[PDB]
């Protein structure tokens, strides 16, 4: 029962090199190198599904801050104000409104100010 490995091995290498498309040089041509590239790609990707949630929140905050300061209050007090007003709109939505409905954002600032006054 002698077993030849070509068909199985070829499918295995091809499955990796296909995931390496777009990579530079040996990384998209040469199995040994492609394999290490695909692994590192998964590692980073795992890492960055966690990081992605960090970077976006960091973006929202920064924009809320800008829009808050435009209406004369700082991010930190604005958040405290809204918390004391039992407003529960989160930061993704608040950052959207900061950009697309400047009049509603101002109204949110007045609700924050009132709750702090």
């Amino acid at each position: 029962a002698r077993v030849k490995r070509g068909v199985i091995a070829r499918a295995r290498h091809k499955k990796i090199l296909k995931q390496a498309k777009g990579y530079y040089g040996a990384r998209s041509r040469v199995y040994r190198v492609a394999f290490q590239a695909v692994i590192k790609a998964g590692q980073y990707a795992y890492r960055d599904r966690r990081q992605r949630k960090r970077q976006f929140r960091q973006l929202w905050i920064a924009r809320i801050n800008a829009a808050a300061r435009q209406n004369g209050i700082s991010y930190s007090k604005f958040i405290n104000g809204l918390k004391k007003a039992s407003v529960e709109i989160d930061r993704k939505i608040l950052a959207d409104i900061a950009v697309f409905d400047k009049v509603a954002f101002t109204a949110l600032v007045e609700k924050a100010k009132a709750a702090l006054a």
Binding site: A62, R63, R69, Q70, V99, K102
Partner: peptide, 9 residues
């Protein structure tokens, strides 16, 4: 652009 709501890194 830190002072604008449209700030984009």
């Amino acid at each position: 652009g830190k002072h604008k709501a449209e700030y984009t890194p």
